[PDB]
From Swiss-Prot:
Homohexamer. Forms an RuvA(8)-RuvB(12)-Holliday junction (HJ) complex. HJ DNA is sandwiched between 2 RuvA tetramers; dsDNA enters through RuvA and exits via RuvB. An RuvB hexamer assembles on each DNA strand where it exits the tetramer. Each RuvB hexamer is contacted by two RuvA subunits (via domain III) on 2 adjacent RuvB subunits; this complex drives branch migration. In the full resolvosome a probable DNA-RuvA(4)-RuvB(12)-RuvC(2) complex forms which resolves the HJ. Probably part of a ruvC-ruvA-ruvB operon. Does not seem to belong to the SOS regulon, no LexA binding site has been identified in the promoter region. One of its GO terms (biological process) is cellular response to selenite ion. The lineage of its organism: Bacteria, Pseudomonadati, Pseudomonadota, Gammaproteobacteria, Pseudomonadales. DNA binds at R270, R289, R294. Residues 234-309 are annotated as: Head domain (RuvB-H). Its EC number is 3.6.4.-. Residues 1-160 are annotated as: Large ATPase domain (RuvB-L). InterPro entries: AAA+_ATPase (IPR003593), AAA_lid_4 (IPR041445), DNA_helicase_Holl-junc_RuvB (IPR004605), P-loop_NTPase (IPR027417), RuvB-like_N (IPR008824), RuvB_C (IPR008823), WH-like_DNA-bd_sf (IPR036388), WH_DNA-bd_sf (IPR036390). Residues 161-231 are annotated as: Small ATPAse domain (RuvB-S). SUPFAM superfamilies: P-loop containing nucleoside triphosphate hydrolases, Winged helix' DNA-binding domain. This is Holliday junction branch migration complex subunit RuvB. The keyword Hydrolase applies. The gene is ruvB. It comes from Pseudomonas aeruginosa (strain ATCC 15692 / DSM 22644 / CIP 104116 / JCM 14847 / LMG 12228 / 1C / PRS 101 / PAO1).
Length: 309
DNA sequence: AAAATTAATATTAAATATTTATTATTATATATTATAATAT
């Protein structure tokens, strides 16, 4: 029972990007040709395979959702391409982790749909039917320059707009059956943390709060009562984050810090911090990073009235 | 003297197919080495 819009117009969250890719879909449909290669990158976990399946039903063809471990050997991908047909498409994931032998096999596969292979050297030339190679990675920066320059469509995925996050909150609460408020929708959009999954988790938890504290009612006051104590903040801070900030600023006064020293002093190993708490705050930019220590920026000083050295 | 020939004549005995320590050689994090700026 996962959250999934049925259609591309039904897909809501990136309206300009949705219109762009709808234009690409109608370009594939009208031209009666396989759609160009689409590069996809952005958030790591977003259910991209399901969206590729939706694109498959929009094309009406089959897309083999494949990844790096699936296509780590060139033989497996060659076999899948041989079972691929005209007008079909192949979802590819973890292209960055894939071996360069895969890259050289996929050079002629998209280069006008051919295949060249060596056998005292003898050359064997093979052909491939036209198709839509789909390349989606968590990060596209590791893609090699000739390969990415030879591609066609490049599409970016990102967390939704705050008003559009609020609309997604409203739709998911209607799916979940929660009697949510537009003020509460904007509240959870401010709490969306850039992640739809943790957003839906917050909808579930405020639904539980409205069930056990209110009379099944989600309002702005109910949402504030649910999300203004413990690891919460209107911007996205936690009391873990506030503790980290306070412990950095009382010790080193916004100066260079030792990461092992921080892990020892906080009674909290630095690994989880740099895995969840630090990357979000640096995603907001609020911590500036040095090779001699992580320091918060002027935003955190303005949060607590602190000076600037 | 000095090497080649041959008839007795005592002598010797037939074990393969498998198997496990005993050597090769192939990754994989992880406690090392390292640099850069930085106060004092």
């Amino acid at each position: 029972r996962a959250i999934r819009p049925l259609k591309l117009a039904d897909y809501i969250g990136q309206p300009s990007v949705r219109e762009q890719m709808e234009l690409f879909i109608h370009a594939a449909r009208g031209r009666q040709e396989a759609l160009d290669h689409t590069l996809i990158f952005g958030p790591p976990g977003l259910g991209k395979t399901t969206l590729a399946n939706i694109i498959a039903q929009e094309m009406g063809v089959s897309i083999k959702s494949t990844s790096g471990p699936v296509l780590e050997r060139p033989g497996d991908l060659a076999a899948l391409l041989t079972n691929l047909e005209a007008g079909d498409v192949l979802f590819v994931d973890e292209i960055h982790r894939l071996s360069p032998i895969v890259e050289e096999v996929l050079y002629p596969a998209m280069e006008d749909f051919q295949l060249d292979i060596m056998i005292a050297a003898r050359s064997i030339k093979l052909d491939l039917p036209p198709f839509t190679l789909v390349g989606a990675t968590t990060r596209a920066g590791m893609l090699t320059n000739p390969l990415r320059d030879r591609f066609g469509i490049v599409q970016r995925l990102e967390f939704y707009n705050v008003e559009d996050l609020a609309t997604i909150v409203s739709r998911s609460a209607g799916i979940l059956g929660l009697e949510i408020e537009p003020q509460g929708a904007a509240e959870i959009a401010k709490r969306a943390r850039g992640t739809p999954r943790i957003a839906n988790r917050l909808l579930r938890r405020v639904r539980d709060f409205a069930e056990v504290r209110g009379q099944g009612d989600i309002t702005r006051v109910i949402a504030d009562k649910a999300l203004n104590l413990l690891d919460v903040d209107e911007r996205g801070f936690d009391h873990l984050d506030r503790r980290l900030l306070l412990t950095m600023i009382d010790k080193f006064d916004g100066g260079p810090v030792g990461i092992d020293n921080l892990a020892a002093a906080l009674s909290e190993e630095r690994h989880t911090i740099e895995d969840v708490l630090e990357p979000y705050l640096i995603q907001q930019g609020y911590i500036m990073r040095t090779p001699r220590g992580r320091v918060v920026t002027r935003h955190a000083y303005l949060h607590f009235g602190l000076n600037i050295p």
